[PDB]
Amino acid sequence: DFCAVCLNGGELLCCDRCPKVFHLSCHVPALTSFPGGEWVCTLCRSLPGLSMYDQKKCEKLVLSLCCNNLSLPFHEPVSPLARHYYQIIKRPMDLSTIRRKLQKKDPAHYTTPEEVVSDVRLMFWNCAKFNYPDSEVAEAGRSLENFFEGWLKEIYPEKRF
Ligand SMILES: [Zn+2]
Ligand SMILES: [Zn+2]
């Protein structure tokens, strides 16, 4: 009943192989039209810039982040009006920036999975550098990073990073 990424209702696409449902633009990659049917989400699929193999793996990683309820504070960039944020944080990073750079036409498209992982960790580092350690946001960032580091060993057991 609820999009797995933004937790809002409306016109939702169901994945056949898992309970998850998505707004078309909340899925990764975003869909621009509905499918006829028998559709499976990026998490349940099989198989310059990223190789097609790494593209799908990094899409699984980024969608796992977006679908986890702890990622909500990190879905969009911080408002540049936000007091002191852009003075402390010289390299802001957020999941809408990561999503966009996963698109192969993007002029800053990722070329290696290490680049994707470096941005994710940059996001967690900025969170802990700016937010009060007992803020709700800082707690969500620490807990989400533990999820991410676990998925990394699951999706790329071989790579060191
Ligand atoms: Zn959504
Ligand atoms: Zn699924």
Author numbering: 971 to 1017, 1040 to 1153
Text taken from the publication that reported this structure:
The paralog of TRIM24, TRIM28, and TRIM33—termed TRIM66—also contains a PHD-Bromodomain at its C terminus. Herein, we determine the crystal structure of the TRIM66 PHD-Bromodomain in its free state and in a complex with the N terminus of histone H3. Further studies show that TRIM66 regulates the deacetylation of H3K56ac by recruiting histone deacetylase Sirt6, providing the appropriate chromatin environment for subsequent DNA repair and safeguarding the genomic integrity of ESCs.
We used the mutant TRIM66-MUT968-1160 protein for the crystallization experiment and determined the crystal structure of the TRIM66 PHD-Bromodomain in free state. The 2.1 Å crystal structure of the TRIM66 PHD-Bromodomain showed that the PHD domain adopted a typical cross-braced topology, whereas the Bromodomain adopted a typical left-handed four-helical bundle topology. There was an extensive interface between the PHD and Bromodomain, enabling the formation of a unified structural unit. The results showed that the H3K56ac peptide interacted with the ZA and BC loops of the TRIM66 Bromodomain. Residues F1122, N1123, Y1124, and D1126, which exhibited the most obvious perturbations, were all located on the BC loop, whereas V1070, S1071, Y1078, Q1079, I1080, and I1081 were located on the ZA loop.
